[PDB]
Amino acid sequence: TMGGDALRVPFLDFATATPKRHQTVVPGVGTLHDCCEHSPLFSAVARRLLFNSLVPAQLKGRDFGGDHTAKLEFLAPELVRAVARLRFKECAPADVVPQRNAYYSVLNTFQALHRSEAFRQLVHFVRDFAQLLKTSFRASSLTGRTYGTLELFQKMILMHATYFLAAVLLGDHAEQVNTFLRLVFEIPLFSDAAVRHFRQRATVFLVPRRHGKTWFLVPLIALSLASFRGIKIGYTAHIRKATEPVFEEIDACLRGWFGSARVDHVKGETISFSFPDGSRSTIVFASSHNTNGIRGQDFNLLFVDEANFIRPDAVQTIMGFLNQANCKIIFVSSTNTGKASTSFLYNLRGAADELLNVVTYICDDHMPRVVTHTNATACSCYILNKPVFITMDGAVRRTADLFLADSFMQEIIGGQARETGDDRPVLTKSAGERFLLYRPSTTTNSGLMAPDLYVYVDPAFTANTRASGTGVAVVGRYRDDYIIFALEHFFLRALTGSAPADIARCVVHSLTQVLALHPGAFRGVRVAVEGNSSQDSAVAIATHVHTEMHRGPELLFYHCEPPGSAVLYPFFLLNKQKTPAFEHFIKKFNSGGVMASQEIVSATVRLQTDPVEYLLEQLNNLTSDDLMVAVIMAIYLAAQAGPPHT
Amino acid sequence: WFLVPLIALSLASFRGIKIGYTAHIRKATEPVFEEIDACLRGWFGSARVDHVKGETISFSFPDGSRSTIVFASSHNTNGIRGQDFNLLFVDEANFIRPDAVQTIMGFLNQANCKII
Amino acid sequence: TLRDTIPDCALRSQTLESLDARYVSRDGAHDAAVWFEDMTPAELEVVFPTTDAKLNYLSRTQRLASLLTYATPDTACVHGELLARKRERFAAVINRFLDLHQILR
Amino acid sequence: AAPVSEPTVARQKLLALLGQVQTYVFQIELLRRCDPHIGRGKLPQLKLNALQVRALRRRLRPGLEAQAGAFLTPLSVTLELLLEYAWREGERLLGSLETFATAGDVAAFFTETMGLARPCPYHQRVRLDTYGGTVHMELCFLHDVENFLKQLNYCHLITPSRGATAALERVREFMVGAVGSGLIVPPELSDPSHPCAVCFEELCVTANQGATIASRLADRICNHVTQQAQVRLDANELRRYLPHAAGLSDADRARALSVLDHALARYAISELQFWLASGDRAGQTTMDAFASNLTALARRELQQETAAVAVELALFGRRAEHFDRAFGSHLAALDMVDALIIGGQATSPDDQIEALIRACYDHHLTTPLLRRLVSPEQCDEEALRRVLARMGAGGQGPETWGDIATQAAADVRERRRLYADRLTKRSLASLGRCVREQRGELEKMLRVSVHGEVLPATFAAVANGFAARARFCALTAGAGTVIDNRSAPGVFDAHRFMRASLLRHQVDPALLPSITHRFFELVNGPLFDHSTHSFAQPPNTALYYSVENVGLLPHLKEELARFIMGASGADWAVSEFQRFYCFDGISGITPTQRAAWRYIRELIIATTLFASVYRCGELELRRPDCSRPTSEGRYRYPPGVYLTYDSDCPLVAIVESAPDGCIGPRSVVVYDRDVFSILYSVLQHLAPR
Amino acid sequence: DDQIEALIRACYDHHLTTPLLRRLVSPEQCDEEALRRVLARMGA
Amino acid sequence: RASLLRHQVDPALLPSITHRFFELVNGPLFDHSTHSFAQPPNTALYYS
Amino acid sequence: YLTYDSDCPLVAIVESAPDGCIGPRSVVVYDRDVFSILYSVLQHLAPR
Ligand SMILES: [Zn+2]
Ligand SMILES: [Zn+2]
């Protein structure tokens, strides 16, 4: 009842040489220098050993030492006998008079939290939850694996409920309660941001088929009612034929491990728990969706069970509840992978943050299901109960034959194949978003640019095909980063007599615009025409570019001496340098080092889509690629290699 | 939150008034019933709390006296004939209740009625 | 009773190891006190008269020193490269944090 | 309620001593930057403090030695680190001060103490030394201790006991140098880009909107192995505390104030233009506001500097040369960024963030895209309301400039407005994340970072497992009747008999979950517990944590999750006669761990089939890494069959230990390598009872 | 039994098929799926 | 001052602080907050 | 008490009397500053 021995210690008036203008008082210890508060290595040990006393013995764990939390408060007997004969100084009288007052007063605010029934409510709630889950949720009396386990979401929901109920019922102790719920959830070392995250309201949960969805909320409610005093948990659902089961499974245990006298029950409507001193907390059911729920007083929870297909004409009361000042609409749901996208709720991930959490076992790409494989529960692993009739196959071929969506389900066919084949994304979404949004204005920061332009043309010499696009990129150095000045995704007119000149006219038009937008900026432009497709056709493009540009900056072409030849052709052959180029790009792009000019030029990609947005769609295929290749290679050239010339 | 204590104290103190309390659709009037009778029976004796569901509530006094809060929320009858109403606590006149303005205009004819 | 070390030594013309062997390492040394003297110089408190002010200076000089040591020919230290990369990323991040808010207007 | 236990007042005494030692290390880190002539004044105080720290050991030495071998705790780890860093840096600084007053030069004193001529003493060699192959790593940074302790945690069933507690003494030797100060972290050994082990649980527990953790973990600062300490510093801090000083009982406290007022009445900002600049130049800009703010900060810094110089001159008589002045020439030739990262001994590193925010946020920004930053919760709430409401119901090719220039001008005229309307109408959710991420990445770089409580906690959590294993290996050797069976004069018969009698039965496929759980419980390590909490979690999750932190190839998670999913005698019995835990013919790290998974599966399935066939025995398959010690020197190992992970004598069967728990004279135990001989010896005991 | 293993390892490789391979490794799920199909076809 | 500036204002207490601010700032003439039928201190301050 | 007097604003009456008046058992603390007032109040109310 009195807790642990860490909140009853004597004075231990050691000493101090620091002036009172500096010394601070850490609770549980004496008065130390101020520098002991900016050092977390001490202010996180001297504070955890205090709240490790408020934590009851039913919450330390399962094998933690008989008498204490050995993993926090344990001193070897030799060390205890050695520090026993250690004696500090003795405080001066005129200094011990106020020091003892400061010490025993900074500790009173802890021996005062251990008494307030507002905090005892939380302690009782958590301790009863733990002791009653020890034996998995059943019809026990509350008086080889034998201990039940909360899965990840079954713990995130409990945290979302408990932190909010604590922040609501305990406002005057918003500091002594956070660093106690940390110890009680075995979640220390957790920055205040990722714990204040649980203080927010309306956090949606998307859960697979069963996962003990309903089996967990009834004990949650039964313990959040008979422990706290003054809350009315609204519990809506789908068609009310499913809510009466919740009635029965709540009242069976709520009357099971408690007295029936305090169980107040009306059929099809509110349930109320009464307390021995004129107190009552209820679970009023907003499932009626008509009345008795519009006026909100102390709801604060609104346990919406299934928001997958929202109940007809029941969103008005929910939106009215959203107006209540202290309501945290938990918004449980169940996407059983039968649809895999409750797009009524799954569209929330578009423009929101820290709102919804999905308990999924297959990623967006359905190939790296093995990402979340060791997390999938072992209870839901049943098979035909026969590996093979007669076969000697490795687990790979077995799982290929026994794929069935890797969970005995019939998940969507197509898109990401069944054999993963080491398929993954390459450029992070975060770098991609910044690439789209932050575009330096090059026309007004020309001093930041290098005086050389690099252009790569990756030609396709066919028409009336989707992979017949010619990619062009013109890039340069911007500070020590790389910036794109122009992009083209050019499609030959069918049966032209001058495909190389049409391509050349396209690139020349792009260059010109870039030159005109930044006059006098560039001393050199270096041009590479990929020749893998056709060397002659690549040479012809270079020749037309050469001639047209002849109408200042010097124009140079990358040249190539093909194997067995002594001739230097103005084309570029893409082979061994592809992997280094791509590798460097990916690293640069992901760290924020490649960007697009705010006044990026594109004649071919202007009416239907934003050129940077279009490039990014191609780039997100890294694991029609003419534009991506031109951009990556133009940048590689601006990077480092052998000299290109006149 | 303020009108229920107002009524609970204006009933159990004066003797001989019948406060009419209309409202919107009668699904909102039963909450007023409950919040009036919970305290009216809370800080007083239940014997003097006379209550019929969906209709009038009456407080009785130890010497042959009774003052009521007869609910004109029915909007059909039991409110047209006025004797000692004098208050007619119309709760929400923002969107007036359908076909309920006739009884209100008849109450306006009563000689000592103050339609709040 | 249980006197400190400052009333014990009383003489400060020697080396540290001699005093160790003479006062704290003798078998007969009673060793019945723990009291850390105040080592901050008043010539430094009168200018940085605040633990926050004595910590900001203690961190600024630490950053300076860590810049100076990393700025016979080994030069192949990962810490120099880490400091260089951190400085470059910080510059590039502040670069795209003033311009981004210039654009938003 | 009056009697408080000794390990409770001893902990308070140790906390007080830790506070005193932390204060002393603060004073040491201060004296390493003060003028030597002033430091020499505190030479007797520093000598006495070093004597006190020396005498503080040689008493806590045997205690902490008996502690390091039995269940380290995050208290006596930081205490060891600080009592070592004090005993190191105090003597080092004292040597550097007694070297002074002989050479009498300051610019060579701040190269000894501050370490400007050292060979970078932040390198170490670990040499994990597992079975099969001794992989070796070097500990260069702070996250490089986390990534090594997690590796040693994951590779614990593969690593010898005394080959690990001898590679942890090599980690502590580095931590004493790096995290030993516990008060400030040098910018060299701090990479906030690399996520820690506790900011992986953050993403697992907080809300994820799709976006699997492998992609969310790459946009993190991890904020836990280093913190920010939120230092604030007033404006007129020198004038406040001037009329109140330690000494100065004379009226000189008034003439000093007079000289301060008289001297008060008496950053390379020219480098911003070479940064990228957008938009219109004429008029106010973000760059102009930033330049004005930085000019104000520089003016305050210069005023504070001149006031401090005047006060030191008027009070003591001599202008002191501290570190920031003796090397002040290097604070002049400093670029904008190299002097923005460091700097501001008068202002605070939060004042630079204030000067940046006051420049990027004025009244002219916008109505939208400004409220989402000041309230990122109302934005998502409004988005939820909106979602709920919506779900409720040719030719003439020109050559000259006059035409191509005009068409390019028109194209850029369209596109400069295109994205400008993107950044304002759409893309609010992306901008509200990009700006709140760049601001965090800035404040983490500018604010004074001190130290995090992660390393001295995970170090203890890892070392406790190996300590307990080596303790159980040696506590059972001294017991009652020992039946050590590593010598096999007549054991082949009883091994083959039991192996045949157990391989005759099927695995009872109704028990495969109770076997997969006890497999994920043995394979997991001691750091990531997540299965003995009060709010426990399935052992597969406690293993997913411990195996995803140390980046494991995805092609090995199926080999772990689907290991006992298939369970005849094939893939059932892998051990030879006496080579149960022997890795002689296997090298590497992953193919040496598959061989350990095989032995663990064999042990588990053999124990299950033995419990099914010979119902007499119970065979609680336990692990010695559990059973943390109680109040003092008691471990109470219950009966069972311990794995012990030791290739010397792996299987230890404690059949009848004691009626109270300890291991003494009534504690007959059976040592053996092989599993089936262990089961036969257990049967020969438990059956005739 | 090693000869049966040598025959099965020859007749069953990773290239056989997606179907006609799961019905051997689980001749119960095949009939269960057939029952589901029959019930769904006879329902409507 | 250091031991108090180390804690946040506990934003769940801001109404109980705004009330005790409008109660100190107000003057003695317009009372309107110690009547039997009292009124919020912000009204007693709006009058004054 | 605030007392609004720039001469000696803060007056802390920590233990006045069991009946209300201010007499010989009415230790009071005069001060300008607030934090020193709080320290003097702590030095009295804590050891009780
Ligand atoms: Zn180094
Ligand atoms: Zn982290």
Tab-separated table of N, CA, C and O in Angstrom, chain A residues 222-255:
chain	number	residue	atom	x	y	z
A	222	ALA	N	-14.201	-3.234	-19.852
A	222	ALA	CA	-14.540	-3.717	-18.518
A	222	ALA	C	-13.587	-3.176	-17.462
A	222	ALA	O	-14.007	-2.907	-16.332
A	223	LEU	N	-12.309	-3.006	-17.803
A	223	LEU	CA	-11.348	-2.455	-16.858
A	223	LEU	C	-11.279	-0.935	-16.876
A	223	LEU	O	-10.956	-0.340	-15.844
A	224	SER	N	-11.573	-0.291	-18.005
A	224	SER	CA	-11.601	1.162	-18.058
A	224	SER	C	-12.879	1.741	-17.471
A	224	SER	O	-12.974	2.962	-17.314
A	225	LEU	N	-13.859	0.897	-17.151
A	225	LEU	CA	-15.076	1.344	-16.488
A	225	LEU	C	-14.990	1.176	-14.976
A	225	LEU	O	-15.197	2.135	-14.228
A	226	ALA	N	-14.681	-0.032	-14.515
A	226	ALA	CA	-14.640	-0.341	-13.095
A	226	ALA	C	-13.389	0.179	-12.400
A	226	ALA	O	-13.157	-0.173	-11.239
A	227	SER	N	-12.578	0.990	-13.075
A	227	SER	CA	-11.393	1.584	-12.470
A	227	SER	C	-11.479	3.099	-12.392
A	227	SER	O	-11.278	3.672	-11.315
A	228	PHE	N	-11.767	3.764	-13.503
A	228	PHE	CA	-11.944	5.207	-13.503
A	228	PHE	C	-13.378	5.554	-13.122
A	228	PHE	O	-14.274	4.710	-13.151
A	229	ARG	N	-13.589	6.818	-12.759
A	229	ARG	CA	-14.886	7.285	-12.284
A	229	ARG	C	-15.216	8.606	-12.962
A	229	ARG	O	-14.591	9.631	-12.666
A	230	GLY	N	-16.193	8.588	-13.864
A	230	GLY	CA	-16.652	9.810	-14.491
A	230	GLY	C	-16.428	9.881	-15.987
A	230	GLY	O	-16.268	10.971	-16.544
A	231	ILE	N	-16.417	8.731	-16.654
A	231	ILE	CA	-16.287	8.678	-18.102
A	231	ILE	C	-17.445	7.869	-18.665
A	231	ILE	O	-17.933	6.925	-18.037
A	232	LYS	N	-17.886	8.249	-19.863
A	232	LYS	CA	-18.982	7.566	-20.550
A	232	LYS	C	-18.511	7.168	-21.948
A	232	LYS	O	-18.669	7.916	-22.914
A	233	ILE	N	-17.942	5.968	-22.049
A	233	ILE	CA	-17.334	5.487	-23.288
A	233	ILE	C	-18.456	5.176	-24.274
A	233	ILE	O	-19.226	4.237	-24.080
A	234	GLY	N	-18.545	5.962	-25.342
A	234	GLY	CA	-19.471	5.637	-26.412
A	234	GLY	C	-18.931	4.510	-27.273
A	234	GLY	O	-17.758	4.488	-27.645
A	235	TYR	N	-19.800	3.551	-27.584
A	235	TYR	CA	-19.409	2.389	-28.381
A	235	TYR	C	-20.415	2.225	-29.515
A	235	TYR	O	-21.449	1.575	-29.341
A	236	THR	N	-20.114	2.813	-30.665
A	236	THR	CA	-20.901	2.587	-31.863
A	236	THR	C	-20.381	1.342	-32.575
A	236	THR	O	-19.399	0.723	-32.159
A	237	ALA	N	-21.049	0.972	-33.657
A	237	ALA	CA	-20.731	-0.248	-34.392
A	237	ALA	C	-21.466	-0.200	-35.726
A	237	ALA	O	-22.007	0.838	-36.124
A	238	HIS	N	-21.477	-1.336	-36.417
A	238	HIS	CA	-22.302	-1.545	-37.598
A	238	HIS	C	-23.736	-1.801	-37.156
A	238	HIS	O	-24.110	-1.435	-36.038
A	239	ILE	N	-24.555	-2.372	-38.043
A	239	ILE	CA	-25.945	-2.710	-37.743
A	239	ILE	C	-26.037	-3.327	-36.352
A	239	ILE	O	-25.268	-4.230	-36.005
A	240	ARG	N	-26.984	-2.835	-35.549
A	240	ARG	CA	-26.981	-3.075	-34.108
A	240	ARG	C	-27.134	-4.546	-33.741
A	240	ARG	O	-27.123	-4.876	-32.551
A	241	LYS	N	-27.280	-5.436	-34.724
A	241	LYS	CA	-27.289	-6.863	-34.424
A	241	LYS	C	-25.938	-7.346	-33.914
A	241	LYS	O	-25.869	-8.407	-33.282
A	242	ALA	N	-24.868	-6.596	-34.173
A	242	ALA	CA	-23.532	-6.954	-33.721
A	242	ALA	C	-23.156	-6.311	-32.393
A	242	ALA	O	-22.144	-6.699	-31.800
A	243	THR	N	-23.939	-5.347	-31.911
A	243	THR	CA	-23.619	-4.658	-30.669
A	243	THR	C	-24.082	-5.424	-29.436
A	243	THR	O	-23.397	-5.394	-28.407
A	244	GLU	N	-25.219	-6.108	-29.512
A	244	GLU	CA	-25.659	-6.949	-28.401
A	244	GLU	C	-24.643	-8.017	-28.008
A	244	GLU	O	-24.519	-8.292	-26.800
A	245	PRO	N	-23.923	-8.668	-28.929
A	245	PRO	CA	-22.802	-9.513	-28.490
A	245	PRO	C	-21.798	-8.768	-27.632
A	245	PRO	O	-21.281	-9.342	-26.665
A	246	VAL	N	-21.505	-7.508	-27.959
A	246	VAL	CA	-20.607	-6.712	-27.130
A	246	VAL	C	-21.221	-6.487	-25.755
A	246	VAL	O	-20.535	-6.587	-24.730
A	247	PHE	N	-22.519	-6.167	-25.716
A	247	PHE	CA	-23.251	-6.111	-24.453
A	247	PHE	C	-22.965	-7.336	-23.603
A	247	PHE	O	-22.523	-7.229	-22.451
A	248	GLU	N	-23.240	-8.517	-24.160
A	248	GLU	CA	-23.147	-9.744	-23.381
A	248	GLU	C	-21.713	-10.027	-22.954
A	248	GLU	O	-21.472	-10.390	-21.798
A	249	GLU	N	-20.748	-9.871	-23.862
A	249	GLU	CA	-19.377	-10.199	-23.492
A	249	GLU	C	-18.766	-9.178	-22.543
A	249	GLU	O	-17.812	-9.519	-21.839
A	250	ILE	N	-19.285	-7.954	-22.498
A	250	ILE	CA	-18.844	-6.997	-21.490
A	250	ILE	C	-19.470	-7.301	-20.137
A	250	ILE	O	-18.781	-7.309	-19.114
A	251	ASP	N	-20.773	-7.583	-20.115
A	251	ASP	CA	-21.470	-7.733	-18.842
A	251	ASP	C	-21.227	-9.097	-18.209
A	251	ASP	O	-21.384	-9.249	-16.995
A	252	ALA	N	-20.853	-10.102	-19.005
A	252	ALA	CA	-20.570	-11.412	-18.431
A	252	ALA	C	-19.339	-11.363	-17.539
A	252	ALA	O	-19.363	-11.858	-16.406
A	253	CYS	N	-18.257	-10.760	-18.029
A	253	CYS	CA	-17.049	-10.629	-17.223
A	253	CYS	C	-17.180	-9.503	-16.207
A	253	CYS	O	-16.751	-9.651	-15.056
A	254	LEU	N	-17.763	-8.373	-16.616
A	254	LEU	CA	-17.967	-7.260	-15.695
A	254	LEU	C	-18.806	-7.675	-14.495
A	254	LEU	O	-18.633	-7.132	-13.398
A	255	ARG	N	-19.712	-8.633	-14.677
A	255	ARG	CA	-20.415	-9.251	-13.562
A	255	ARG	C	-19.708	-10.501	-13.059
A	255	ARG	O	-19.975	-10.943	-11.935
